[PDB]
Every structure is written in C-alpha cells, then in structure tokens.
Design a protein around this ligand. Structure first.
Ligand SMILES: [Mg+2]
Ligand SMILES: [Mg+2]
Ligand SMILES: [Mg+2]
Ligand SMILES: [Mg+2]
Ligand SMILES: [Mg+2]
Ligand SMILES: [Mg+2]
Ligand SMILES: [Mg+2]
Ligand SMILES: [Mg+2]
Ligand SMILES: [Mg+2]
Ligand SMILES: [Mg+2]
Ligand SMILES: [Mg+2]
Ligand SMILES: [Mg+2]
Lengths: 80, 199, 135, 131, 156
RNA sequence: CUGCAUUAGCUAGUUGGUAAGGUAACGGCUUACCAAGGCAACGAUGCAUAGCCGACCUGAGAGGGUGAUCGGCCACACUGGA
RNA sequence: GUACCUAAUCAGAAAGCCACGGCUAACUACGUGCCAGCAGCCGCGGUAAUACGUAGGUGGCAAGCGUUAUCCGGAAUUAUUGGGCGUAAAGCGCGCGUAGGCGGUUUUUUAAGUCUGAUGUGAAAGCCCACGGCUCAACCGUGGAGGGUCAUUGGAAACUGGA
RNA sequence: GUAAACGAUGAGUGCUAAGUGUUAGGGGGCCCCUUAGUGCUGCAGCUAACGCAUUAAGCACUCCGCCUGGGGAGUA
RNA sequence: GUCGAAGGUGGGACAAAUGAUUGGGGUGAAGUCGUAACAAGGUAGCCGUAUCGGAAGGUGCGGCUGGAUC
C-alpha cells in the first residue's frame, strides 16, 4: 500500500466539534540570501472523540476531503 | 571574390603584403589616400587590435560575419584560441588550394574553387569556406586538368607547407595533418585578435 | 544591511521612465481606452507648424510641428533637414529622439515618410533625410 | 554579548599577527583547539598549548614570522556565520588562494582542511578561509 | 625597459596674473619579464614631463610573480578608492583589462589575465591599486618556505 | 509560482458538527438543525495586471528581462443562461 | 520535368549604406557664417568649421547599411556573490519592552538542517558536447551531458537544531 | 511631541603601541599595581581628505533603524 | 411551483474626463523693488517655535558651531 503523508504539530484550536487545528512548522530558505525562515501552516484535522486539547503535540495523516477545509486525521497524541 | 577592391591599398593601409611578396609595399609603404604620404599618428590600443584583425581577415579574403563565426567555432575547440583560429583559417579549401599551389593568388584559388574546378575526395566541392580536415585529398576536375592557369601555377614551384603533401604530376594534394603556428603566417599576432573580440 | 533585514525587507531596484512616452501608448476607439503597446513610430496630423528658439547658449530658429498622434496624444516633433513642405493638417510619421536645445520637443518627424518630403539636394546621409539616390 | 567565538579567535589571531606578537592567549573550546591544531599542521602557527583553568580552559598559540619578519598568516576570514551558515558539497569545496591558502571545514569526519574533504569526499560547513 | 604614457594632464595653478599651466604625465615602465614600475612627472612641456616620469618609474620597479604568463592566484589590488580584481587565466585568454591596468599588466610580462576595475577610474589610483595587487601576489615556493612545507605538501 | 498597506481587517453556507438529498466520486456540494466558529501583519480582504510551463534574450557568474513560432496543460467559440 | 547533372555562349546583366572633434577605426578643400544647420553625451556654428552642407580622400560593413522602439549589459547605481550611513544621501531625540533574529563551556543522545549513496521521476524539442547526413554552413538526425528548493530509502555525525 | 533633540558618530560583546591629567574607589610598598568614569597627546590600522585612534571613524560577530543625483517637496 | 439569464428600481463605493474661479511650482529679456546669505557680509550664521512686516526678512525664547578679532 502507498503511504499517505504524516505531519507532527501543536494543536492551536480545539473550539470546533470533532475538529482540531494543527500548526505545522517548516523552514523556507530564501532564494537569494539562503537563510532559512520559519513558516507555519494550520491543518484542519478530524478528532472524533475531541481527545486533543490546545497545546498538545499531535501526529496527523492525510485523508480524503472530510469537510470543506479538513483533509487530515489525528493518528496519535505525541505530547500533552 | 567577395571583396574585389584594391589589394594594394589594403596592403599599404595594413602595413602587410597581402600577396606575400611585398610588391605593394615596395614603392609606397604608407597608408593610401591624400594623407598617406604625411606622418601617421600613433594608433590607439583599439586601433592596433583592429589593425591586426583586419590584417588576418583581408589576408584570407573573408567577410566580417564569416570571420567572426570562424573565430567563435575556433574558440569552442581545445587549446589556445588564437592558434586554433589561425589553423582553422588555414584549413579552408581556399587556403589549402592556394598553399598546394594550384593557383598563384588567393583570389585565383578562390575563383577556382568557386567555379567548380576542384575535387575533394574525388567529389566536387565548390564552397571556398569548406573546412578541409586531415586525410582529405584535394584534386583538379578531370576537365580542368589542362587549364593554363593551373598548369602555369604548378610549373612555378611554389613552396608547399609541411602539413600538406602535393603531387604536381597528378595535380593531387593531401591535407596530411593540422598546420602548426610555425607553418602559419608569422606577421599575425593572434593574441591582439582575441583581445579585439573580447572588446 | 544585515541578512535578516534583507530577508524581512528585500532590495528594491529603481524603475526607469521612457524618454518617448507617446510612442508607447495606443488608443482603442470602441472601448475608449488607452492601450499599452510599444511602437517604433506613430502616425500623426500636424496641428501647427512653426519655429522655436533654442535654449541658450545655442541660437537659431528651429523648425518643428505640433502633432496629434493616432493615440490622440499631442506632442512637439522636430523637423530635421534643410527645408520642409509641412503645413497644418499634414500627415506625418513620428519617431523617438529628443532635441537637447529645444525644451518641449521629445520626438522627430521622419523625412520621406507619408506627407513629409525628403530633403532636396541631400547627397550624403540621404537615408536619414528621406532622399532617393541622385543618379 | 559574544555571538561568534570562532570569529573572535580568528580576529585575535589577526590582531596579534598585525602587531607581530609572538604569542596570544584565548578562552578554549573543542572547536578552537581543532582549528589551532590544523594551523600548526599546515605550518601557519608554531605551537598550540592548552591550560586547564577550571572554567573552559585556555589556548596559547605561538605565531610564526618568517625571515625578514614576513608573516606566515596573511589573512583569515570567517565564512559560515551565526547570521548566515555556509555549507558546501565535496564537489563544491572551495580552493583558497589557488591552493596557497586553506579552508577549515566542519564535516561528519571531523574538523579538517579542504584538501582532506575533497580526498575523503565529505562536505560540510565552511568555518573559515586562512591564507 | 618599454615605456607607455598612460595619461597626460594639463594642471593649473592660479596666480594674480591668471592661471599658470603645467603638464603632468603618468608613465608605466616594464621589461615584460616580471618587473614593472610607475612614475609621474610634471613640466611646462609634455616631453619633459614624460622624461621625468620615466626616470621616476625606473627608480621604483616591482617584481611580479608570474606562472607561465599569468598571475599565481586571484587578487584584488586596492589603493584609496581604486580597486582592481585580477584573476589568473588559461593561455590564449589574452589580457582582459581596461585602460591603466592593461599597461601595467602587459609591461609586467603578463599575457593572460581576467581583470575588472571595481573602484575609481582616475588613472593614477587605478595604477597604484594594480601595483598593490601585484605586490600582494605570492608564489607557491615562498608560501612553502614560509609554512615549512614542500610545494607538493602545500597542494597535498 | 505577482505588484500595491496612501488596501487592515475579512467572512454568516461563512467554520465545524448532525441528518438527509445529490454526484463517477469525497466534500457545505446542497438543504434543514445545532454550535460559534474560520481567515489575517508568515499580508487576509480589496485594487491593478496577467493564460501557465518546457523555453527564449542578456549576463563571467549570481542575477535581470520575457513567455512568438514548436511541444505540454488550461480557458474560450457573437454576448449571457440552460 | 522541381532538385541535380551535362554541354554551348558571355565579364557580359549583379553594390549599396553609414561614418571620419573625442569616446571610436577613418581628414582635407570649398561654401556658409550663433544663420542654415548638427547633436547619444561633452558640445559645434557669430568669416581660415577635420562637428553644418557639398566635393575629394579615408574608415566600417555588405545584399545590406542606418534610424527609431523595447529588454539585458556596462551599473559594485538595491551591492547574497558585491556598497554604505562623523563632515558627501543616510543613526529613530531617548528609554521600557513584545514578536522575531542571534547567543558561553563540557558530556550523552537524536538526526530536522548539513554531508554522502541508491531508487523513481524532472516528456519531446531546445541549450551544451560528440558523431552522422545534406557539395559547406545554416539546417536535419542520433547518442550523451546537464537541469529539483523533488520524493523515497541507506549510511556519517563536526557544526546548526531538538532532548 | 518638535530642535544643529549633535559626539551631525544606534545598541551589545571581544581584540589591538604608548605618554600624561583628573573624578569615585580597591590593593601593595611618596611610589607602584588595579577597577569604573572623564580629558589631552599619539602608534598600528583606517580614511577622499579632514581626521579617528582602548571614550575608533582600527580589527571582528549579533540585532535594529536608515540611504541610493539635484529641484519640484517634506509639497499634493 | 422552486431555481433562474436578461431587464427594471434604489442608496452607496470607486475611477476617469471636464468646470466659472483659485493656489503654489517650473521655465523664459539685460523688467520693477529692496539687499537677506557668502568676509566680523558690515546686527555671526543656522535649527525648532511664536509673532510681525511689500519682499527678501525682523524680533522674542531655547539650542548648535557647521562662528567669534584683539
Ligand atoms: Mg488577459
Ligand atoms: Mg556583470
Ligand atoms: Mg549628419
Ligand atoms: Mg546590477
Ligand atoms: Mg549629511
Ligand atoms: Mg543618537
Ligand atoms: Mg529533455
Ligand atoms: Mg526630527
Ligand atoms: Mg581611562
Ligand atoms: Mg546683507
Ligand atoms: Mg548679517
Ligand atoms: Mg518688529
């Protein structure tokens, strides 16, 4: 089986129902200067049991579109 | 040819005998025209570079476009650019025919090739710009074997460079190998020409 | 600047202005809008033809014409050569090139194109002044 | 505050070299000792001594001055910096002064010169150029 | 020694009567075999200024390290606001340099070089910058001696 | 993979959930119901401009400029809707 | 009945354009006289103009040569490579501080950055290199080489990051 | 909420000849050593020059603010 | 019957053109008035501010030397 992409980030919003927003931080090198700059993307993730809470590190895997904006699911909670 | 003007005036201007005999420079070794006899001011660095380029160009009777294209392809090769340019100029069917001695003049050799008298590897080549490579045999067309011009030129035992190998009996030459800078004209400072094309 | 400053705020090149703005605009009649297109020459109609006094220290009467171009921009175009046939309502080709003496003239009239006649008796640099070979 | 201890080391060497001091002392670190050892190995500096101090240690470098007091080290430059880190692949390793100078490179095989890096086919962070 | 007149300048000193003019000459001197010099001379007449410059240039001659008609390593010669980058080139490259730099490099016997004037274009400061660069040029033998290594050890 | 902050707020099917309908198909895709979310100085929203790319022009290079011909992808077919 | 080939006849039908004070290769005469004009810039022209116009001569190119428009270069004049801020343009009047950027020494560990491989992919055409076909060349064909900030997977661990 | 608000010189850190005065200390024999200020003089180095020079405008690393011909205009 | 192109009506937004008149700017006669700055520029100059005057400018207050003879 081909593998879906997996990301690790911190939950920044738990307000929505059965949903958590996970901020994934990556570095983008400047094309000219060459310095890496911190960049963040919020990924809307499915949390069926409303298990996760703001401030917990989480592992998310890509899925089929589960909503208008939700494309990922919560694999596990790495830290709390 | 292509340039068909006064070869003497061009020799006198460039301070070099294009015929290779000095007949142009014997009586009046100074630039042509009204102000020729009067003193000539010193050439600028650009003036010297241009002079050297024009010397080589008019020696081989080439147009500027073709001269510059030849300079480029020479540059793309391996070794010293200037030398490669000069050997590549010498490898022209024009120059090869002249140096074999099938004609007494470079323009004559050019007309011979251009009018279809010359054979390369048994087949007719009519482009004076044709680039002869080592191992190729230059010959005269079977019909043109008895041309007064060719026979008379061959009778005049012109010195044949070492990189060529001519048989006057058969009117057949062979491009044995690439020329050497030693064998090429000594009046040309190719470095100036490289510099000219640098800027 | 520091590298962090260069990343936060990039280096910015100076934009340049055309010396010949009127040639770089077109007009659409149907949409009634100006079009941005680069043109080497433009046709125009001479609103006025007269002489101008050059900026000091130069002194002369310089021949010029005010031309309404096809894009509808009014400009002052210099008339080169000795003598001209141009009058008001003449149709002319205008190219780029400013006259340094004349303050407002940023264009030249092309000689020997459309209505503009070639300079008569020009025998050197005829192509510049629209004169045919004399022979 | 102090942001680049390596750059400080190279500047101390540069400053002492300008005034033709025989020796210089600096606060020690494992990287700075390794840099010093390469400089002695390449013949840029005479000697390196380490003194335990109960803090971070002290490195003592003895500088080399040729006959006529000609300086063996002409120049030193920090390449990779805290502000902008510089790395090279083994293929892309730079030559300093056409091989007359050296580049000190931090590689997974240790802190080494550019020549060793090309030989071992291991790239890394370019710490400095010394010529 | 070959001599090339880089620039001639008419300079003026103002007096009560008016301006008094003299001519200044900058001349490069070289044997075309690794020794080059520069000198300036001032006189009422250009020939006399040239002559004084030649004598000055001969007094100060700098030895230039050359590796087969090129420089040993890349160098940027800097003097005042004058800056000249010089990079060694392969044979047949020719002298790629502009104005004063060309005169200095040619008379030093360098036939192949890549150069760019990065600073002032004032002739004297360009020349001084060029000379500075050549003075800071080093040869492998000397570097090896200074570093107590063989030339082979220098290159590994 | 684009400019502009003399454009700083934006959004209410909007953000999520539940159920149903609908589609080749996942899905606010749609509709009721429930909750108040979602986006934004890491530039949202607005305004201007533009088909995109393989390439092409220039430059020692790093870069800068451009997107004819040919090939790929997209969009359009008097205008708008079905 | 095209290409090509052969034979016969004929130098006969086949050179123009710009420039020549400096940059920038190439100067004289005559006319004109701050006029007429020239001009990219410095400028030139008011009576002995190598700068205007023409002529002779020369220079640069050539079935082209010039002009205009536009882009890159030269321009290190947005400077990562590769500039600066006492007096030239440029240090906020000065604190307190938030985000961000950056950060002392040692050990252990990890392996995100970093380094080193493998695999897949980055169409073809093009560029580049080589070879081959066209009388040559342009052009055409073929094979390499190159092109990711790429993905996946195996190692190394000094430095940066994490613990 | 602005001044020629000036050292027309951002802040932090380290390094690089000396001589001399002065302010508040510390230490050891009037002298010597030392810490933090405040002046003058002066190498190396730097600078277009003037000058700066352990109170850098020297040699370095970090971060911030600012500049890119003059006028129009600090205007609309 | 729902949805629905076009069309109609309404209050706003933005952009461009034009408008009696008016404001400062620029350029151009060897125009008119004075002489403010550059020397101790004949009251050192300049900076911020306030006020006054045909005009440059004057004066007050604070500041700077990028001034100050003997
Ligand atoms: Mg469009
Ligand atoms: Mg460049
Ligand atoms: Mg003309
Ligand atoms: Mg540039
Ligand atoms: Mg200033
Ligand atoms: Mg301050
Ligand atoms: Mg391809
Ligand atoms: Mg202020
Ligand atoms: Mg003190
Ligand atoms: Mg006064
Ligand atoms: Mg006064
Ligand atoms: Mg009063």
């Amino acid at each position: 089986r081909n593998d879906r992409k997996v990301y690790v980030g911190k939950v920044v919003s738990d307000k929505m129902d059965k949903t958590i927003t996970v901020l994934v931080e990556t570095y983008k090198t400047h094309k000219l200067y060459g310095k890496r700059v911190k960049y963040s993307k919020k990924y809307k993730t499915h949390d069926e049991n409303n298990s996760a809470k703001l401030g917990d590190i989480v592992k998310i895997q890509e899925t089929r579109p589960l909503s208008a904006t939700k494309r990922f699911r919560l694999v596990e909670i790495v830290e709390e | 040819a292509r340039f068909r003007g006064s070869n003497w005036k061009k020799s006198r201007r460039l301070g070099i005998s294009l015929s290779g005999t000095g007949k142009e420079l014997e009586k009046r070794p100074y630039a042509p025209g009204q102000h020729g006899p009067n003193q000539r001011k010193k050439l600028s660095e650009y003036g010297l570079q241009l002079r050297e380029k024009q010397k080589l160009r008019y020696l081989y009777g080439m147009t500027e476009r073709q001269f510059r294209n030849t300079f480029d392809i020479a540059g793309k090769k391996f070794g010293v650019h200037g030398e490669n340019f000069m050997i590549l100029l010498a490898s022209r069917l024009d120059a090869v025919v002249y140096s074999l001695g099938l004609a007494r003049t470079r323009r004559q050799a050019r007309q011979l090739v251009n009018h279809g008298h010359i054979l390369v590897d048994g087949k007719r080549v009519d482009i004076p710009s044709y680039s002869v490579k080592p191992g190729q045999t230059i010959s005269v067309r079977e019909k043109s074997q008895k041309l007064n011009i060719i026979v008379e030129s061959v009778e005049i035992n012109n010195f044949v460079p070492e990189y060529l190998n001519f048989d006057a009996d058969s009117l057949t030459g062979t491009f044995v190998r690439l020329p050497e800078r030693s064998e090429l004209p000594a009046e040309i400072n190719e470095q100036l020409i490289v510099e000219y094309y640098s800027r | 600047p520091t590298i962090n400053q260069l990343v936060r705020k990039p280096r910015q090149s100076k934009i340049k202005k055309s010396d010949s703005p009127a040639l770089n605009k077109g007009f659409n009649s149907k949409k009634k809008k100006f079009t941005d297109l680069n043109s080497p020459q433009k046709r125009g109609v001479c609103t006025r033809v007269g002489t101008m006094t050059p900026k000091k220290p130069n002194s002369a009467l310089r021949k010029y014409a005010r031309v309404r171009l096809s894009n509808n921009i009014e400009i002052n175009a210099y008339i080169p050569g000795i003598g001209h046939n141009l009058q008001e309502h003449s149709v002319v080709l205008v190219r780029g090139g400013r006259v340094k003496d004349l303050p407002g003239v940023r264009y030249h009239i092309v000689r020997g194109a459309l209505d503009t006649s070639g300079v008569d008796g020009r025998r050197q640099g005829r192509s510049l002044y629209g004169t045919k070979k004399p022979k | 505050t102090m942001t680049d201890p390596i750059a400080d080391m190279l500047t101390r060497v540069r400053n002492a070299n300008m005034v033709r001091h025989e020796k210089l002392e600096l606060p020690a670190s494992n990287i700075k000792k390794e840099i010093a050892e390469i400089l002695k190995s390449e013949g840029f500096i005479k000697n390196v001594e380490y003194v335990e101090d109960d803090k971070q240690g002290v490195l003592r470098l003895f500088l080399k001055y040729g006959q006529n007091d000609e300086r063996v080290i002409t120049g030193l430059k920090r390449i990779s910096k805290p502000g902008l880190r510089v790395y090279a692949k083994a293929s892309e390793m730079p030559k300093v002064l056409n091989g007359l100078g050296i580049a000190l490179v931090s590689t997974s095989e240790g802190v080494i010169t550019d020549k060793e890096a090309r030989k071992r086919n291991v790239g890394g962070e370019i710490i400095a150029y010394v010529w | 020694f070959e001599e090339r007149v880089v620039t001639i300048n008419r300079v003026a000193k103002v007096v009560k009567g008016g301006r008094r003019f003299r001519f200044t000459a900058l001349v490069v001197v070289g044997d075309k075999n690794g020794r080059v010099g520069f000198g300036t001379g001032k006189a009422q007449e250009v020939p006399e200024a040239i002559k004084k410059a030649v004598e000055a240039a001969k007094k100060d001659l700098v030895v230039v390290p050359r590796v087969e008609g090129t420089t040993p390593h890349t160098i940027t010669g800097r003097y005042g606001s004058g800056s000249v980058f010089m990079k060694p080139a392969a044979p047949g490259t020719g002298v790629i340099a502009g104005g004063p730099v060309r005169a200095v490099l040619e008379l030093a016997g360098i036939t192949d070089i890549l150069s760019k004037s990065l600073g002032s274009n004032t002739p004297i400061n360009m020349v001084r910058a060029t000379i500075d660069g050549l003075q800071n040029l080093k040869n492998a033998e000397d570097v090896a001696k200074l570093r107590g290594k063989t030339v082979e050890e220098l290159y590994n």
